[PDB]
Amino acid sequence: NAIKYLGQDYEQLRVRCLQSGTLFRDEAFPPVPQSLGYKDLGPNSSKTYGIKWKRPTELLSNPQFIVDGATRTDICQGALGDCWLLAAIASLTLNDTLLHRVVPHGQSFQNGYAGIFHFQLWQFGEWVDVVVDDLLPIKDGKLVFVHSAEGNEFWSALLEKAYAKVNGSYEALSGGSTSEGFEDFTGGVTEWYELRKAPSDLYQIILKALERGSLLGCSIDISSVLDMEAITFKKLVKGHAYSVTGAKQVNYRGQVVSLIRMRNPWGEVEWTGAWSDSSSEWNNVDPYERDQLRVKMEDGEFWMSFRDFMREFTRLEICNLT
Ligand SMILES: *[C@@](O)(C(=O)NCc1ccccc1)[C@H](C[C@@H]1CCCNC1=O)NC(=O)[C@H](CC1CCCCC1)NC(=O)c1cc2ccccc2o1
Numbered sequence: 486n487a488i489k490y491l492g493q494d495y496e497q498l499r500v501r502c503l504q505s506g507t508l509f510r511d512e513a514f515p516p517v518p519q520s521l522g523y524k525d526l527g528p529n530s531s532k533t534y535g536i537k538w539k540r541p542t543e544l545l546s547n548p549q550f551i552v553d554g555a556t557r558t559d560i561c562q563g564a565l566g567d568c569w570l571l572a573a574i575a576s577l578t579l580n581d582t583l584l585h586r587v588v589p590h591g592q593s594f595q596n597g598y599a600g601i602f603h604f605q606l607w608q609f610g611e612w613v614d615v616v617v618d619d620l621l622p623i624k625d626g627k628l629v630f631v632h633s634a635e636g637n638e639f640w641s642a643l644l645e646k647a648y649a650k651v652n653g654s655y656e657a658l659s660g661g662s663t664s665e666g667f668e669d670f671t672g673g674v675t676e677w678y679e680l681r682k683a684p685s686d687l688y689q690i691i692l693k694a695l696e697r698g699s700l701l702g703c704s705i706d707i708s709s710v711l712d713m714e715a716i717t718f719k720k721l722v723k724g725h726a727y728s729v730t731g732a733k734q735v736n737y738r739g740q741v742v743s744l745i746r747m748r749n750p751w752g753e754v755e756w757t758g759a760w761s762d763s764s765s766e767w768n769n770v771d772p773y774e775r776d777q778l779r780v781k782m783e784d785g786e787f788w789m790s791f792r793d794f795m796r797e798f799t800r801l802e803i804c805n806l807t
């Protein structure tokens with residue numbers, strides 16, 4: 486079983502608050518400026534203007550922990566440079582066993598609610614159970630940091646808060662490497678591929694890793710500080726972590742074409758080239774494969790041919806449990 490982070494015992498704390506008729510207040514990570522950050526999100530920073538702390542039960546009538554599953558569409562980046570972490574969370578949702586360890590299902594804002602939630606994180610070689618109270622940073626009535634596409638779903642906001650807590654602040658998460666999130670969610674180890682010097686069986690490696698439930702991510706190198714977050718003509722984002730979420734071969738124009746699916750953790754802004762949501766390539770695939778694979782939705786998720794993926798992306802990471 487998990488070690489209790491800072492000795493905090495989720496069930497004992499929840500039970501005490503429920504018996505006291507009160508809501509949990511986390512003395513280890515309070516709703517104070519220092520929990521937001523120290524410089525860019527520091528006390529005298531314009532970027533913290535109007536940010537307040539509110540529980541979901543102070544925001545909406547029927548807040549939910551999980552709605553329609555804990556899935557990758559629940560991961561929509563906010564105003565914090567933690568794309569690496571959010572790509573890791575989205576990839577985690579594809580591994581059902583690890584997802585249910587990291588995110589204890591059954592926590593609720595209704596029955597048994599006492600303003601306290603918990604998550605499991607892999608930290609310094611061990612699983613640890615991290616509690617948070619459910620006060621979250623809000624500006625203009627909306628979550629400022631990660632949020633779900635479902636406006637009344639909070640498991641991912643609370644998971645990001647727990648990750649901030651073990652790092653001391655939200656700002657501590659701004660700028661990072663996806664491998665750290667992958668490993669902190671799985672206990673596995675990340676292998677890095679330079680796509681210019683990829684083995685000839687990389688596609689099969691990707692297929693098998695997705696099938697096993699490994700966590701995969703990819704990115705485009707920057708050439709200078711100016712390329713950071715630059716949006717290309719075909720609406721890829723440079724210096725930005727993507728989740729690799731699928732891979733399938735389809736019959737197309739008399740050949741077998743290998744496709745790969747990835748997801749921008751913004752939850753919006755997608756590739757516009759071949760195999761994009763509205764591209765003409767789907768006209769020439771099997772109608773069942775078209776129905777199984779293609780979703781016409783601005784959700785950050787899209788397909789590319791493996792050939793285009795190797796032309797446009799620079800790096801791939803595969804975090805295997807093994
Ligand atoms: C990511 O694209 C993101 O969070 N975008 C939304 C956003 C951007 C800016 C402000 C708020 C929200 C980030 C964006 C950068 C981080 C924040 C500061 N300015 C940015 O452009 N991109 C990263 O975090 C990249 C992602 C990695 C993923 C693995 C492959 C390489 C790119 N990482 C860094 O920028 C980074 C990583 C590390 C590690 C150690 C020290 C410093 C550092 O910086």
Ligand SMILES: [Ca+2]
Nearest residue numbers: 552553554559
């Ligand atoms: Ca959901």
Ligand SMILES: [Ca+2]
Nearest residue numbers: 762782784786
């Ligand atoms: Ca899409």
